[PDB]
């Protein structure tokens, strides 16, 4: 059973790691996307 | 490589969107190249 268990721990495992490496990934555009946002808050809507 | 589906359906999905964010980001320099500009009919290059 351990050497079935072992298989499926792998398996999510390594999901868990693509996960991980695509949601930090994607905070980074998150936070260059909130960069922007405070740049234009800034640039067009408090001041021209 | 069936029993392992989700991470083929993952690396398809992810370049996808990759190649996808490579298109809108060219679409948005061409449109940048492009906004405000007005031509002539009567410009040729060959000439001027």
New interface residues.
Partial sequence: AQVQIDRLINGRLTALNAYVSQQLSDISLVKFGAALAMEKVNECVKSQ | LSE?G??CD?INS?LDEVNGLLDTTQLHVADTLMQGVTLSSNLNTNLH
């Fill in positions: 392992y989700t991470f993952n992810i």
